[PDB]
Amino acid sequence: MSKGIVKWFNSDKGFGFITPEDGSKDLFVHHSEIQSGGEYATLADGQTVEYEVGQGQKGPCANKVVAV
Structure with a gap:
């Protein structure tokens, strides 16, 4: 449901x-x-994606990344 903009994506890392x-x-x-x-x-940098925010021990994370 939720979606934001990727600050920067590095598949190599x-x-x-x-x-x-x-x-x-x-x-x-x-x-x-x-x-x-x-x-x-x-x-890449600025890529728009859809994700779900799920709390964690270190903090919330984003899962189910869908390119848009």
Whole structure:
């Protein structure tokens, strides 16, 4: 449901940081955590994606990354 804009995505590192649309603090996003039928999905700096915020011990994370 929720969706924001990726501050920067680096597949080489295997992770990136996203900037919440609502203005919330950046959330950790991993390449392997993406959820899409296609295997050619790519991400970069400013890439718009859809994600769910789920609290964690270190803090909330973003899962089910869908390219849009």
